[PDB]
Amino acid sequence: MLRGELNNEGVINFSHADTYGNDSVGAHLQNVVYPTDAPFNAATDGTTDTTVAIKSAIAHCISKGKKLVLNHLFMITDTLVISDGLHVECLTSDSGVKSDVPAGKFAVKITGANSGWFGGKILGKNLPESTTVRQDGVLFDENAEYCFITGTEVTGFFAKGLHTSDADGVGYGIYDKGYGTLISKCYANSKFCVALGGTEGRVLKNRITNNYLTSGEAKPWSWASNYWDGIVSENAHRYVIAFNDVSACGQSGIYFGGNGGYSTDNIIVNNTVYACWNRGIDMGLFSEKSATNDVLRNIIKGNNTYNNRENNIWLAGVSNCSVVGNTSWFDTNYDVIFAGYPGGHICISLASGANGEACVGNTIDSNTCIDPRGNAGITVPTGATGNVFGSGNNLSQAGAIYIASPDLITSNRFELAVTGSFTPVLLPESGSITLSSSSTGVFRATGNRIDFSVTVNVSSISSPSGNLNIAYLPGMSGKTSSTSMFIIDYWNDLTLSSGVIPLASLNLENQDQITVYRTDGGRVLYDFSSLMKSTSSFILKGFVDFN
Amino acid sequence: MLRGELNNEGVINFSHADTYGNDSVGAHLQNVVYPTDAPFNAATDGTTDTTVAIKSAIAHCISKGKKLVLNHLFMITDTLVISDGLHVECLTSDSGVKSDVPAGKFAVKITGANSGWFGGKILGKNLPESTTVRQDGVLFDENAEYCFITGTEVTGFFAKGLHTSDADGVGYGIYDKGYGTLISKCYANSKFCVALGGTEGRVLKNRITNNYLTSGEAKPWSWASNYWDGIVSENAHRYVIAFNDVSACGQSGIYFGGNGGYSTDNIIVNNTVYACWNRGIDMGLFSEKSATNDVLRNIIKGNNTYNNRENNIWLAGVSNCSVVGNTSWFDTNYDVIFAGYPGGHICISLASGANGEACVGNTIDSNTCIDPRGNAGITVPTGATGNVFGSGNNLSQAGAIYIASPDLITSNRFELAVTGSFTPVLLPESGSITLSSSSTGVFRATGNRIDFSVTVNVSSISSPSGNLNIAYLPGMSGKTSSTSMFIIDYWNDLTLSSGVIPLASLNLENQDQITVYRTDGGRVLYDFSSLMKSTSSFILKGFVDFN
Amino acid sequence: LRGELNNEGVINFSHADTYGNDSVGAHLQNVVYPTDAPFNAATDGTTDTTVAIKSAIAHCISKGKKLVLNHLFMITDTLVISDGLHVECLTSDSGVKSDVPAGKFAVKITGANSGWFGGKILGKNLPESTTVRQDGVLFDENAEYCFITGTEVTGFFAKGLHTSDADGVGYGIYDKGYGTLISKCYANSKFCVALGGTEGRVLKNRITNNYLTSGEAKPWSWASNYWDGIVSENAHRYVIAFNDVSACGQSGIYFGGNGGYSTDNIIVNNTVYACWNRGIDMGLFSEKSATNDVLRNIIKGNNTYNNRENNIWLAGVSNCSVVGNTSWFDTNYDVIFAGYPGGHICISLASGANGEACVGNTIDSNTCIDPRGNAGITVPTGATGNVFGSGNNLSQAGAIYIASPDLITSNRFELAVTGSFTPVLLPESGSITLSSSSTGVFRATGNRIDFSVTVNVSSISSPSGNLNIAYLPGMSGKTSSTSMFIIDYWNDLTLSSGVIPLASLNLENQDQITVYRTDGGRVLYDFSSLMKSTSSFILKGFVDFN
Ligand SMILES: C[C@@H]1O[C@@H](O)[C@H](O)[C@H](O)[C@H]1O[C@@H]1O[C@H](CO[C@H]2O[C@H](CO)[C@H](O)[C@H](O[C@@H]3O[C@@H](C)[C@H](O[C@@H]4O[C@H](CO[C@H]5O[C@H](CO)[C@H](O)[C@H](O)[C@H]5O)[C@@H](O)[C@H](O)[C@@H]4O)[C@@H](O)[C@H]3O)[C@H]2O)[C@@H](O)[C@H](O)[C@@H]1O
Ligand SMILES: C[C@@H]1O[C@@H](O)[C@H](O)[C@H](O)[C@H]1O[C@@H]1O[C@H](CO[C@H]2O[C@H](CO)[C@H](O)[C@H](O[C@@H]3O[C@@H](C)[C@H](O[C@@H]4O[C@H](CO[C@H]5O[C@H](CO)[C@H](O)[C@H](O)[C@H]5O)[C@@H](O)[C@H](O)[C@@H]4O)[C@@H](O)[C@H]3O)[C@H]2O)[C@@H](O)[C@H](O)[C@@H]1O
Ligand SMILES: C[C@@H]1O[C@@H](O)[C@H](O)[C@H](O)[C@H]1O[C@@H]1O[C@H](CO[C@H]2O[C@H](CO)[C@H](O)[C@H](O[C@@H]3O[C@@H](C)[C@H](O[C@@H]4O[C@H](CO[C@H]5O[C@H](CO)[C@H](O)[C@H](O)[C@H]5O)[C@@H](O)[C@H](O)[C@@H]4O)[C@@H](O)[C@H]3O)[C@H]2O)[C@@H](O)[C@H](O)[C@@H]1O
């Protein structure tokens, strides 16, 4: 009669296990599955284990192609596997899971095509002081394709002391090994907040920090800490990391290596990155370079990076990477939050890799560096080649660009100018000339042109005769030149007839020398060394355009 | 039996106030709450005040941890407060609230952690001509944390005439004083469409206009207008504002101050900003600079800005800001939409602040400026220091960069070149030498190099003798150089022995003077003044690398 | 009780019946499934459900309700989403499968704030078929701030070109609307996405038609079922950002230019690769007009690589910027394009197809990588007003290539260009002939050209009077603010003691340098008659040009 009909329509004894006809209420209801509904019957107290109920709800929802909505904060003790394009929706910002999952496994694993998680919380025990507790939050595994997590708070996954393998528990908040994984509008806060090891991910609009600063964990930092990087990337390819707020991390805010990883073609744009205990944006080789360990072709653009202890933007042994349009700065809050533990405090730094590998083919342009201590807003190490340092960089409010060696001026391109000095010597064809130490050389590199001023003051001679070159022009050794232009505009105490004047021209066999010579009517003569006394001076000016 | 059971299960007399067992149909339905359900029983006629019913629903959803969904457009007359992580979901794009909330309060105030509003509409009275009505739309308050409003039409909040305090009703569409607020995929149209006073907000992919151009409000614009900025920002920190379509505003498209405001570290990228009655993108100090009033370290990058009346991109008294890779332009639609009311029509302008504050340490590179009237693509005022104008800037389809005074070329760095002229004079060690007005000087500054050419045509003399200097080199007063090179490639009517040639070298004491001298065999002599007749001429050429 | 359970939607539940607000029935009427009464859509995925789904659509619009598609539903005519309706797919497997015929779309979206979340919109997917022609999702001219998000749109093809849109075109998603949002989608069809509206936003999509793995026979031709990832004509104020665009049968992202007036678009932070034409492609194929041009587009921060016929390509465009992009190749190029070589240039400027010049474009701060050592950037004859910035890094590719030395003064190369010329001498009377050993070198940096000239006479014919060296590349018809030349070497000239050669730019003919000499406290312009058949000198200096 009526009671029988109501049961037939899931109006009473409503279970998701039952078949109802499509015009029934029971059927309409079976489109949305709560784990509290029958036959899953999840607890709602948040203390009793719900792992079994939720796994069944998952598996049902996959089987019948229905939607899963988690309507409480549910305690679990084993990994939940979100697969087969199943979407876990959280009813509110307080729903999700709380994880007593054991070390060695994740709270949640997302895999398959187009699976993911909306909203809520995925919470670990949050005991960073504990010497036993080791957990991991969310994994997108190697099979994840266009999977996602959006709007979710993933916190409290720590693991004190470094793992030896993944089986130990690592302390990942979110670890992505998938293809095309979207992580957006999430809050992630764990030993390693977000770890990237996949391809074509998008990490957009997230808040990322493990708040080392306020943690209470004794300084100094060391490998035993429960507070590492905001983002840590190894074998990460073609990620975009945009619009994130990354601060106060135990190590670096956004890191790519370079340490058993081959990380290439990532784009890091329009992020704020600050107050980190290591580097802000950190691209670096710590393992030695190989076909399977490198950092290449990454674009760092339009970010605002400041007060990061050991440099805001740090490139070590990386190649073909671009740092364009970023504002990198410090203020006296640096001295407060890092009191006792002073860092390098550099806006933008290039350095060799751990095993000596050069920065090659990197492009640094249009950045605004502010360093009120006057540290060099950009630093360049010995060994670096093929890098371009554009003139659109503004270091007026920092120290000028610092280069570790003068040979860098011809082995890279400094459009942002570089100035230095050198001690000139003279090379007569025979005999010797010795120069007073009043004698100076100055040089400025601007792109592929170098300007030179050389003041030569002889202190003594010994039987100098024949041709004469000045030496040695910084950068120019083993280099050639398309054009060059030199004059002598002052001299004293030379043995010259009247209407004989000196002439100067780059030595085309050794283009780090300038040959000095003299007129003689309708020709010139290369006898200048015999016209020199122990009291002679001259001053030479000009420039070279090198190749 | 059956009646008593269906009542126990929520199948009849369904209410969210009842307790039901978890396998009941009632428990299932209670996961989602419509204010039309018992015990809220909101009116659906769109005309009856529902404030009380909706607030009950909201307090219930907070108490019990359930989803709220507005299923109609709902009249209200007091502020709805969305707190405690509650999300308001609008069932369709027609759902939401219509506000008759009175002056001094908002329609919707959002606060706490992870609270927000999806979809639908939030409509003011939309009476911009009214001299009485005053309303405010959505507020995120000082305790809002990672709250959001996404996908929502917020319109019609107006207030004719300026407010004296917030109590008066201001005419904000959306006003964010929160931390980490998201505003995305909204349409905001109100007197101040969007106001920013918080930290780490994300204003993404919105449509922003109060449609001044078609409003019918009588011109000229004045302080009494009901149409002000699209985005108005005071005390805004670490915002990213990206992908917005911003236009036709009564004042500026996107503005930061500087007028009761300490606005720093914001990123404005990839927006389109056009047809505004003040400026496109506007950063300036209207009130005096202080530790609590300033605009610092903002990034303006990749934007398309056009046909804004009083300039596309405007920087006034601001420091350490950048303007990189923007396309800024005008066409003949300027004079249609602004007929009768010409404004600056500059693509990128720097200015002093209102109280004369200098633009310091700004970076302008890689921008394309198109001005078919030939107005300077970029304008630099007197007082600006530490700024860098890159050579990546393309002003070929506009006027060339205009500087207010020549001394700017050595207090800033113009890689984008600046060319001018000056009248040379001769300073003899003794007597006087007077130049014809045919004598010319020209300088071109490129980065920290200035090239010069001077033509010296003497008109008279008065007992000249001793050394000679040409003066004064533009920009070079009180400056020093690391290298330079000058020659004299033409002379006429001078008192020179056979083989004696003129030499020229920068005065190292006063480095805006070029010392002119000549050869005497194996030394040189500084007696050029006396070698000079009243008909003497020479031409000097060279460059100075200044520090 | 049964009468009340009927009156409260607890029994015979239908969206047609009216219930009061406290009823269960009312609560359920907020969310509409087409499988619910009175629509009763089939669930087998093979029965046609058009009538059922359209009825549901009109209903949800009529009553202001939410429509959720809870299965994959076969259709045979266009579903029209209007009046602010959001279609919401219950899961990633729900949606529609289209056997709609040629000349119409599976789903059409229109009016204000209408859209589609999630699921699939799936075509016949028969790209080998010489009959089947379909189109996927249209936003028409009346779409206003509509959207599709979260959706897989695939399998819409049409072998052979259409004559009109009524033939069926092979579009995946086609946007003709204002302020359209296409995001988090997967689009894979003949033309994966097509753009012809205004102020659209195309964000974080995956876009490809997988030509490389298609098995369609090469070479490519107009008969192919694999064209562009993004095709734009009459496209204004789009942002295209965060997309993975790859392996397309024509270009990854294309604006024209071919019956299209496309302006003020921003293309940023996309990855673009392995396409069979160009990566990012902006050009005029039809002739330039007031309704056919491509203007003021921004290309910025992209990573483009191994695109067969050039990574970034501008042809006859104006006011466009290419800034901070990373453009590169590697040896995989030779693998995926074996038997079909292309240009293999990272960034190239060309004329439009009817000879139109690239005007007023901006190239700066790009990193180009080419192991073949092809020119990172190529500039054609005719280009005017372009600025190539010194922030570009080509150290790992070949240096910038210009087709003609004229370019150095009609554009601004801050990225320096070096070249050479044969000098001649131009004596006031007679003739001096130079050895072929004579050389002329130039480098242009900005609006400065630096020159080295070695002049080596081989024979004379009674020369006299003034002397000019000519012709300085680029300087024909130009003027200069400043110049500086010296002569630092000479042999075998007829010069008295204390007479040296001077040189200065010829101010009447500013591609010439006047050579002359000292004579006490004046100079004399008599140098031609001081030369012999074995005379030599070398001239150096620079011109700043206006
Ligand atoms: C700075 C001054 O400014 C003006 O006054 C003048 O220009 C003046 O000349 C000038 O001084 C010169 O500055 C040079 C040094 O520049 C500074 O910049 C460099 C980088 O270019 C350093 O940052 C330097 O700091 C010191 O050296 C570093 C190495 C120390 O940090 C340690 O780094 C370790 C390596 O780890 C990292 O690298 C790997 C890849 O290999 C991964 O990416 C990692 O993620 C990354 O962290 C790290 O393991 C250790 O724990 C340390 O953090 C740093 O402590 C400090 O000692 C900085 O001062 C100088 O060369 C010249 O001599 C002048 O002094
Ligand atoms: C431009 C031409 O190009 C070629 O032909 C040649 O190079 C030629 O030399 C050249 O001319 C010269 O260029 C200068 C012209 O300057 C133009 O650029 C400046 C800025 O650099 C101005 O835009 C100028 O316009 C005038 O001056 C401004 C100030 C007037 O606007 C008023 O501004 C008030 C303040 O408000 C704003 O500022 C505050 C902060 O202080 C906040 O940010 C606000 O939000 C912001 O709106 C405002 O209250 C008033 O209502 C006005 O809007 C403007 O009306 C106009 O008077 C423009 O011409 C010149 O220096 C030189 O003499 C040659 O003319
Ligand atoms: C490359 C070397 O590098 C260093 O070693 C040295 O510097 C050395 O000098 C150097 O050589 C020089 O390279 C010059 C440039 O050559 C290459 O770059 C150009 C562009 O700058 C070309 O890509 C060139 O390839 C040829 O010419 C093009 C036109 C051919 O492609 C065809 O394009 C047709 C039109 O379609 C396109 O344009 C329209 C707009 O009109 C739309 O945008 C379309 O979407 C777009 O596809 C197309 O229909 C046809 O199917 C073709 O694809 C190409 O086939 C090829 O012939 C490339 O080699 C060089 O000029 C100089 O001679 C030196 O050799």
PDB file of N, CA, C and O in Angstrom, chain A residues 410 448 476-483 506 508-509 511 544-547, chain C residues 443:
ATOM      1  N   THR A 410      83.807  40.552 -21.243  1.00  0.00           N
ATOM      2  CA  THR A 410      83.743  40.075 -22.613  1.00  0.00           C
ATOM      3  C   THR A 410      83.174  38.698 -22.771  1.00  0.00           C
ATOM      4  O   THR A 410      83.182  38.146 -23.868  1.00  0.00           O
ATOM      5  N   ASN A 448      78.936  45.616 -25.782  1.00  0.00           N
ATOM      6  CA  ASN A 448      80.143  45.117 -26.456  1.00  0.00           C
ATOM      7  C   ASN A 448      81.143  46.227 -26.861  1.00  0.00           C
ATOM      8  O   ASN A 448      81.942  46.053 -27.791  1.00  0.00           O
ATOM      9  N   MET A 476      90.200  41.754 -22.691  1.00  0.00           N
ATOM     10  CA  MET A 476      90.416  41.699 -24.154  1.00  0.00           C
ATOM     11  C   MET A 476      91.283  40.545 -24.627  1.00  0.00           C
ATOM     12  O   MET A 476      91.432  40.333 -25.835  1.00  0.00           O
ATOM     13  N   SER A 477      91.763  39.734 -23.697  1.00  0.00           N
ATOM     14  CA  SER A 477      92.711  38.701 -24.044  1.00  0.00           C
ATOM     15  C   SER A 477      92.024  37.544 -24.735  1.00  0.00           C
ATOM     16  O   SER A 477      91.062  36.960 -24.209  1.00  0.00           O
ATOM     17  N   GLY A 478      92.553  37.200 -25.903  1.00  0.00           N
ATOM     18  CA  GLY A 478      91.929  36.231 -26.767  1.00  0.00           C
ATOM     19  C   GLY A 478      90.670  36.746 -27.436  1.00  0.00           C
ATOM     20  O   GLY A 478      89.763  35.956 -27.704  1.00  0.00           O
ATOM     21  N   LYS A 479      90.577  38.068 -27.641  1.00  0.00           N
ATOM     22  CA  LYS A 479      89.376  38.688 -28.248  1.00  0.00           C
ATOM     23  C   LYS A 479      89.744  39.471 -29.472  1.00  0.00           C
ATOM     24  O   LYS A 479      90.905  39.890 -29.652  1.00  0.00           O
ATOM     25  N   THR A 480      88.776  39.631 -30.352  1.00  0.00           N
ATOM     26  CA  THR A 480      88.958  40.500 -31.496  1.00  0.00           C
ATOM     27  C   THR A 480      87.957  41.630 -31.448  1.00  0.00           C
ATOM     28  O   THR A 480      87.045  41.635 -30.606  1.00  0.00           O
ATOM     29  N   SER A 481      88.038  42.521 -32.428  1.00  0.00           N
ATOM     30  CA  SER A 481      87.280  43.738 -32.368  1.00  0.00           C
ATOM     31  C   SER A 481      86.931  44.256 -33.748  1.00  0.00           C
ATOM     32  O   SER A 481      87.762  44.255 -34.637  1.00  0.00           O
ATOM     33  N   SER A 482      85.684  44.698 -33.904  1.00  0.00           N
ATOM     34  CA  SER A 482      85.182  45.162 -35.188  1.00  0.00           C
ATOM     35  C   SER A 482      85.704  46.565 -35.495  1.00  0.00           C
ATOM     36  O   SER A 482      86.010  46.891 -36.649  1.00  0.00           O
ATOM     37  N   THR A 483      85.760  47.402 -34.467  1.00  0.00           N
ATOM     38  CA  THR A 483      86.238  48.789 -34.588  1.00  0.00           C
ATOM     39  C   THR A 483      86.847  49.172 -33.273  1.00  0.00           C
ATOM     40  O   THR A 483      86.423  48.672 -32.214  1.00  0.00           O
ATOM     41  N   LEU A 506      94.807  50.026 -31.791  1.00  0.00           N
ATOM     42  CA  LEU A 506      94.747  48.734 -31.166  1.00  0.00           C
ATOM     43  C   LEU A 506      95.662  47.738 -31.919  1.00  0.00           C
ATOM     44  O   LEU A 506      95.680  47.691 -33.153  1.00  0.00           O
ATOM     45  N   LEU A 508      96.483  44.558 -33.543  1.00  0.00           N
ATOM     46  CA  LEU A 508      95.530  43.664 -34.155  1.00  0.00           C
ATOM     47  C   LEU A 508      95.987  42.222 -34.095  1.00  0.00           C
ATOM     48  O   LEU A 508      95.212  41.328 -34.381  1.00  0.00           O
ATOM     49  N   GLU A 509      97.215  41.985 -33.641  1.00  0.00           N
ATOM     50  CA  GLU A 509      97.656  40.622 -33.332  1.00  0.00           C
ATOM     51  C   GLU A 509      97.315  40.246 -31.887  1.00  0.00           C
ATOM     52  O   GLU A 509      96.918  39.126 -31.617  1.00  0.00           O
ATOM     53  N   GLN A 511      94.894  41.920 -29.169  1.00  0.00           N
ATOM     54  CA  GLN A 511      93.986  43.060 -29.068  1.00  0.00           C
ATOM     55  C   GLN A 511      93.720  43.475 -27.636  1.00  0.00           C
ATOM     56  O   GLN A 511      92.737  44.174 -27.380  1.00  0.00           O
ATOM     57  N   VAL A 544      87.003  50.319 -27.620  1.00  0.00           N
ATOM     58  CA  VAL A 544      87.019  49.187 -28.497  1.00  0.00           C
ATOM     59  C   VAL A 544      85.601  48.639 -28.573  1.00  0.00           C
ATOM     60  O   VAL A 544      85.020  48.359 -27.552  1.00  0.00           O
ATOM     61  N   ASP A 545      85.181  48.259 -29.774  1.00  0.00           N
ATOM     62  CA  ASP A 545      83.988  47.423 -29.992  1.00  0.00           C
ATOM     63  C   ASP A 545      84.419  45.982 -30.233  1.00  0.00           C
ATOM     64  O   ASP A 545      84.788  45.618 -31.366  1.00  0.00           O
ATOM     65  N   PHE A 546      84.269  45.136 -29.224  1.00  0.00           N
ATOM     66  CA  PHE A 546      84.676  43.745 -29.322  1.00  0.00           C
ATOM     67  C   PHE A 546      83.590  42.836 -29.851  1.00  0.00           C
ATOM     68  O   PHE A 546      82.411  43.239 -29.988  1.00  0.00           O
ATOM     69  N   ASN A 547      84.018  41.649 -30.276  1.00  0.00           N
ATOM     70  CA  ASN A 547      83.174  40.714 -30.984  1.00  0.00           C
ATOM     71  C   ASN A 547      82.778  39.659 -29.996  1.00  0.00           C
ATOM     72  O   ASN A 547      83.603  39.373 -29.137  1.00  0.00           O
TER      73      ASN A 547
ATOM     74  N   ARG C 443      79.131  48.991 -37.073  1.00  0.00           N
ATOM     75  CA  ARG C 443      78.230  48.442 -36.079  1.00  0.00           C
ATOM     76  C   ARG C 443      77.239  49.497 -35.606  1.00  0.00           C
ATOM     77  O   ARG C 443      77.640  50.561 -35.145  1.00  0.00           O
TER      78      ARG C 443
END
